[PDB]
Amino acid sequence: MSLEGKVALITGAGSGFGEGMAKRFAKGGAKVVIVDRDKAGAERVAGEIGDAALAVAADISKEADVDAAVEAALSKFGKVDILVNNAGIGHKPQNAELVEPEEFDRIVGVNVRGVYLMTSKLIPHFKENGAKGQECVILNVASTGAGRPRPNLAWYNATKGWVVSVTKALAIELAPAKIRVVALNPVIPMGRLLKPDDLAEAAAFLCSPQASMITGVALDVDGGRSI
Amino acid sequence: MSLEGKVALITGAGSGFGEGMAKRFAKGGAKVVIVDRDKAGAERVAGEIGDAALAVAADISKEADVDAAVEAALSKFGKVDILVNNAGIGHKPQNAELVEPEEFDRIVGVNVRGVYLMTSKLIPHFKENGAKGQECVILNVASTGAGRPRPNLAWYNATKGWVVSVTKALAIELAPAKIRVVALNPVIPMGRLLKPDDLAEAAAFLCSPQASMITGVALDVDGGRSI
Amino acid sequence: MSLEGKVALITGAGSGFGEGMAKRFAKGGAKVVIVDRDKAGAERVAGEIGDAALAVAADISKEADVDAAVEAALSKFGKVDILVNNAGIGHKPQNAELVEPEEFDRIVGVNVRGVYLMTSKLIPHFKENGAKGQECVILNVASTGAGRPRPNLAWYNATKGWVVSVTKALAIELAPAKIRVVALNPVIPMGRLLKPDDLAEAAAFLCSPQASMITGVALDVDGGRSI
Amino acid sequence: MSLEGKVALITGAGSGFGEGMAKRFAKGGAKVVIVDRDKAGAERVAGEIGDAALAVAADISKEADVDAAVEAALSKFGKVDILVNNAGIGHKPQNAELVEPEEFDRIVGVNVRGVYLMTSKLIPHFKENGAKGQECVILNVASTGAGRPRPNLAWYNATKGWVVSVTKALAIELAPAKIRVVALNPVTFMGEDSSIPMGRLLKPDDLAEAAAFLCSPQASMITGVALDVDGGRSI
Numbered sequence: 008m009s010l011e012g013k014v015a016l017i018t019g020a021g022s023g024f025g026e027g028m029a030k031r032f033a034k035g036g037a038k039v040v041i042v043d044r045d046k047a048g049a050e051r052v053a054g055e056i057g058d059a060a061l062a063v064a065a066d067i068s069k070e071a072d073v074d075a076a077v078e079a080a081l082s083k084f085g086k087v088d089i090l091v092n093n094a095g096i097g098h099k100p101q102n103a104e105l106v107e108p109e110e111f112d113r114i115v116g117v118n119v120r121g122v123y124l125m126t127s128k129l130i131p132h133f134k135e136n137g138a139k140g141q142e143c144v145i146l147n148v149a150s151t152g153a154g155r156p157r158p159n160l161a162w163y164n165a166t167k168g169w170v171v172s173v174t175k176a177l178a179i180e181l182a183p184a185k186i187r188v189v190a191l192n193p194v195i196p197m198g199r200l201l202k203p204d205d206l207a208e209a210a211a212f213l214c215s216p217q218a219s220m221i222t223g224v225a226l227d228v229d230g231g232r233s234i
Numbered sequence: 235m236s237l238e239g240k241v242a243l244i245t246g247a248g249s250g251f252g253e254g255m256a257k258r259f260a261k262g263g264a265k266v267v268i269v270d271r272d273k274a275g276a277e278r279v280a281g282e283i284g285d286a287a288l289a290v291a292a293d294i295s296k297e298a299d300v301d302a303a304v305e306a307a308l309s310k311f312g313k314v315d316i317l318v319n320n321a322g323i324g325h326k327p328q329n330a331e332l333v334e335p336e337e338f339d340r341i342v343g344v345n346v347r348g349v350y351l352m353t354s355k356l357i358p359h360f361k362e363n364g365a366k367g368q369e370c371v372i373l374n375v376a377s378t379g380a381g382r383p384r385p386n387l388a389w390y391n392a393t394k395g396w397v398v399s400v401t402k403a404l405a406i407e408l409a410p411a412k413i414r415v416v417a418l419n420p421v422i423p424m425g426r427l428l429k430p431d432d433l434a435e436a437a438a439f440l441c442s443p444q445a446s447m448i449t450g451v452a453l454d455v456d457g458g459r460s461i
Numbered sequence: 462m463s464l465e466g467k468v469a470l471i472t473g474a475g476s477g478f479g480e481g482m483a484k485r486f487a488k489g490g491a492k493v494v495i496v497d498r499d500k501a502g503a504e505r506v507a508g509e510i511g512d513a514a515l516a517v518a519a520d521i522s523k524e525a526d527v528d529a530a531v532e533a534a535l536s537k538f539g540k541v542d543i544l545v546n547n548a549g550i551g552h553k554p555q556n557a558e559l560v561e562p563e564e565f566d567r568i569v570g571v572n573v574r575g576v577y578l579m580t581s582k583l584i585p586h587f588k589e590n591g592a593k594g595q596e597c598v599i600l601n602v603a604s605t606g607a608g609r610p611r612p613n614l615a616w617y618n619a620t621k622g623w624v625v626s627v628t629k630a631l632a633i634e635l636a637p638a639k640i641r642v643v644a645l646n647p648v649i650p651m652g653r654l655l656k657p658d659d660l661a662e663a664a665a666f667l668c669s670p671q672a673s674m675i676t677g678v679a680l681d682v683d684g685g686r687s688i
Numbered sequence: 689m690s691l692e693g694k695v696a697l698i699t700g701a702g703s704g705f706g707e708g709m710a711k712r713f714a715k716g717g718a719k720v721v722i723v724d725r726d727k728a729g730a731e732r733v734a735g736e737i738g739d740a741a742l743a744v745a746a747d748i749s750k751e752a753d754v755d756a757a758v759e760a761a762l763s764k765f766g767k768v769d770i771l772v773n774n775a776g777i778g779h780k781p782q783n784a785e786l787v788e789p790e791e792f793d794r795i796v797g798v799n800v801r802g803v804y805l806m807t808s809k810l811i812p813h814f815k816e817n818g819a820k821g822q823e824c825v826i827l828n829v830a831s832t833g834a835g836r837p838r839p840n841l842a843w844y845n846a847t848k849g850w851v852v853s854v855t856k857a858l859a860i861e862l863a864p865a866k867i868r869v870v871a872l873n874p875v876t877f878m879g880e881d882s883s884i885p886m887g888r889l890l891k892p893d894d895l896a897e898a899a900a901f902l903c904s905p906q907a908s909m910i911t912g913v914a915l916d917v918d919g920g921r922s923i
Contacts, residue, residue: 070562103580103584103630103634104580104581104582108574108578111574111577112574115573119573119623120562124562126557126558127557127560130557152630155629156629156630156633156923157633158630158634161627164626165573165623165624165626165627165630168622168623168625168626168627169573169620169622169626170619171622171626172610172618172621172625172626173622175461175608175609175610175618176557176610176614176619177557177615178423178461179423179461179612180556180557180610180612180615182423182424182425182457183423183425185425187424196405197414197446198409205446208444209448212439217439219424219432220424220432220455220457221453222423222424222457222458222461223423223454223460223461224454226448226453227451228447228448229447230409230447231405231409231449231450233450234406234449234450234836297789329861330811330858330862331809331811331812335751335804335805338804339801346800346846347792350789351789353784357783357785381853382688383688383857383860384860385861387857388854389854391853391854391856391857392853392854393850394853395849395850395852395853395856396800396846396847396853397846397849398853399834399835399845399846399848399849399850399852399853400842400846400849402835402837402845402849403784403833403837403842403845403846404842406837406838406839407839407840407842461609461610629923632885632923633885633920636885636886636887636920637885637887641886650859650860650863650864650911651863651864651908651909651911652864655909662907663907666901666906671897673886674888674890674894674917674918675898675916675917676885676886676919676920677885677920677922677923681910681913682909682910683909684863684909684911685860685912687912688860688912
């Protein structure tokens, strides 16, 4: 019941962690907009969640797709309260200098430009919500690789460092507008793998009124791997 | 299931943040051991909570008081699953060089030795539980002063730096024993004060099975103050 | 004479910090390749240093300009031992949501893609030098805003977070190849403004053999701003 | 000659990193006060440097020893410009719960109380130098284990977290008095002689060079930092 009444828009929500978060948010009483590049993925997750979910196929590196995604969410649910920037792509592990410009550009398009587009497009609506006293949350999913890289994912890890840094910058700027901005760093000392439902719980907590005084942070959820 | 069935020993539980946590944990179905140098404070808080709370007067800077506290917790509740190192004393803000050795040594004795004593005394018990499948949590309450100091609390802030650092060291070492070790840093951009309520919610999340993959972290709860 | 016999390529070296480092490096006996989008400014700085300097006009957001710059460096001086990524652009301070895509993308082109392009194009050469027993250094100029943003520079500050993160990732990956990768964060409790020569000295230190055991760090040079 | 005319007091200077720093600072023109609990060690290092060096026997965990140490430095050299907090003790690697209170107390006494004593007793003099236009520096030697611990050194590492945190707290408070406070994080606890991404081990001279840079006018706008010198170990 923690998120009852709230509307969350979640990117990369057709699979893995994004799907886990959307299912968990919906179980908490939230309406969920399932945004993914994979249309079959988005539709399947929407189906499994049920009436609380809207499926939206989009390539968030593209301005037009973001605009369409946002319009569809607003049209279906009347407002957005929570944005989870979760979509991300990598490169296969390799020597940094072997990643070529096309691949590098694609990675930046989703992991950097996508976050920029999705966020800047929803900020005016969030500010409007905050003026009527309805607090909003932007949650960015980054990675332990942002601040604790191992070799061979240089360009991917750097986009995640961008995400953590943008989280702090937006948080200090948007706080007085009643918009919180947080991040999660998913990855092992605890001796088991991270499952989508683990990350989902941290996300539901951070996006709930139980975390109303928490903004600008990057929470590691990683079994102690970043230590 | 979250805190139902758990036993939490909380230091400095006779007022402020410590009291807030004890009441929040008890509401979650936990048993709580109310540890404070202030006997009347511990008894007041324990009576405000009722049958699920046990009062224990103790000066955690003293080894024999810690032992008696651990012994009374186990005598009463059979086990301890959660330790909250919350007890802390500071100095009146002042030029660093004006804090005299006697007062300095007192601050260290509670904020540093008290943590060492209460934690090292519960670890063998925590390892036994963890080995039997009952995961345990150590929660340390530090301060945003540890990493983001402002003038005139130098020696107080440094003991909080000690707390953040020991959280990390204990977490990496105890993770294989299935004991998590985490920290909170209570403090304003969000435009309002932090209440014991707020910090208690974060403590309840981090000490729950909903945080089973979170260890080694220090989470700021500060309305953005430290950005 | 600490940098005697070394060749440094410095981007954005036609003015400001970049120029200060170029002159300081040359005073330490290095040959310097002055790279800047502003041809007349690259020429000015090169002319002021003398025979030890080569002016090179380049838009580092374009692969063709990068390849040409690296070729010209190698053609003139036979090798490059030090790369300083210092070229950066930003936006007028303003609300984040008011920075439009064309401007957002241009900032990324210089601050993100330009560093990736210049760095990846030099790594094979740095690896060759490393195998011949010659230590190479990549110095990334980021900003205090990366980790301590103030409102209104969100997307700019984010690119600087990308740079600090890429410093760590490349440092871990390339250490075995005898290539150090370090960052500086220029900015005030010390009560005065930061001058080019202040940063220049930190740079000359980090790029010299006196720092041969320092890699993966981001050094704040900020009179205490980041504390 | 970057430190010519400056006076540096260095703790744990009887061996290892501290002895390395002391010789390096003296080569740069500084007078050096060699403070160590091991009296014979202090006297050896002072004798190896010459007239620029003064040996001082002190257990810096003790206020009385610290008072005598400071008085001796001022009476010999007339002033102190640089303080290096380098002395440190640890415990043998073991399960954290096995370190007993008496050992724990000893570690806090040197690594924590010792830094508090030496620094708080020099601050009023450092503020006088500051007011006269003479910049001072406090350099604290911490460790990569403060922010990046590995198992078995919990209580040692935590004292080094305290060092890093106090460096930040004192830096912000003391900056307007013209006193910088900085820290070094090197990866045996005092660097004494007879895996690493960079492919060799840290030597006292590596650490000494970083310290010499941080304590010089070439670093006049650097304060509040904790600089890792670890060959990439902490990344």
